[model samples]
Target: SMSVKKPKRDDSKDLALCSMILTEMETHEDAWPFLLPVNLKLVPGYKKVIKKPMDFSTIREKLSSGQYPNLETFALDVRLVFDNCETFNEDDSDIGRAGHNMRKYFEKKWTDTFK
Candidate 1:
């Protein structure tokens, strides 16, 4: 298991939820029990904590407080531990859709942001 000082802040196991969401979406595009509209924006109650690049100021504050530090490094650490979440159950199918979206996002980002 990974280490976390603030379990309230860092429910690392929440990664499983993200994984499950992708799995459900992959298996059945319409299968997500708790998720609808099949869109991240529509997923309920998720946006409260998950920070976008702009909203990461909270994260920066956490860093200054020594609750966490070094956004450049910990940003990816945060993602790998708990990101990509929609509203599904973080199952195998959810993981597949995540991979699908990851590829699509990477390609779009590469072309749009890089080239």
Candidate 2:
């Protein structure tokens, strides 16, 4: 008989971790800017600047539906929220500041939770 060499894929663990992180992010004070997708009508040129837009609500929906294959995909989308914010808003602006803070918070939690 041959050894069963299965890939180390923990879907349940990844899902739980992602869910917890998302809950924390949603409760954070700086989460307002990232709560929903950017309004293209309200903020003209957003679509032109950011090719792939991401937000907490979208991530939540994907996570709930088991769309993410792994934690890496989830992390990418989470980081995209902050990256898009930085690209669109000035560093000193309210949304920009919130994005920076939220990114830092998420990074810390991510490391603590996974690595």
Candidate 3:
């Protein structure tokens, strides 16, 4: 009989951190409505630029899967998706407010996690 050895994960802290981020996102899905349609009037030919709706559950899985090589890149990628809002409402929009709160949540949780 042949025995195979599995690779060991020396950094359990990283795994724990990633799990924490996923939990935060999962819990705040209602507060963070990323499915809201973005206002593309500001951008030219924005119809073509309109991409698929952002899915937090999918993102959660990706982050928890340990697919990212480093935490820095993962954090940056998540921020870019949740924070950057080129298309937004003028003064008061429910979706706009939700989006802002969502971004703030991400910043407070993941951004400050490292620091």
Candidate 4:
């Protein structure tokens, strides 16, 4: 007799949680800077600095389009938004401050819900 095992990875719950947390971030006060792609006209050389740009609207689209196979993947994109902010903006700048605040908010919610 041969024994075979099937790998079953359940992602429904994580998907729902991702959606909820994304919604919270969307409505957050500090979410403005991250709501959409950085305007190239407004910030020249932005794409040159940050090769991979991530934002809430893009994340939401990816989430809905089934791009994220797991919670960690979803979280990575969320963190990317902050990472790009820090790389491109000064710490004392308004957008930079908002990025810090938003990152803190998301991490807190992420821990409470999943950790």
* Residue lDDT tens for model 1, 1-115: 5685544445453334433433433354432332332334875754665444212333334444555333234335334322444322354675546545544543453344223
What value does the lDDT take at residue 110 in candidate 1? 32
lDDT of each: 0.40, 0.91, 0.60, 0.92
**Residue pairs whose backbone atoms clash in candidate 3:** none
Quote each prediction's TM-score: 0.23, 0.90, 0.60, 0.89
Candidate 2: lDDT of 57? Answer: 96
Q: Per-residue lDDT tens digits of candidate 3, residues 51-103?
A: 54344555566676766677776666565555444253332577667667777
Candidate 1 vs candidate 4: which has greater lDDT? 4
Candidate 4, residue 11: how far the Cα is off, in Å: 3.7
Q: Number of the top candidate by TM-score?
A: 2
Count of clashing pairs, candidate 1: 14
Model 4 error, position 77 (Å): 0.2
What RMSD value applies to candidate 4? 2.9
Flag regions of model 2 displaced more than 4 Å. 1-11
* Residue-wise C-alpha lDDT for candidate 4, range 1-115, written one tens digit per residue: 2587677666569988889999999999889999998887788889688899999999999999989878999999999999999999999999999999999999999999987
Q: Give the top-scoring candidate (lDDT).
A: 4
lDDT of 2 by residue, 55-96 (tens): 999999999997998899999999989988898899999988
Better of 1 and 3 by TM-score: 3
Per-candidate count of clashing residue pairs (backbone under 3 Å): 14, 0, 0, 0
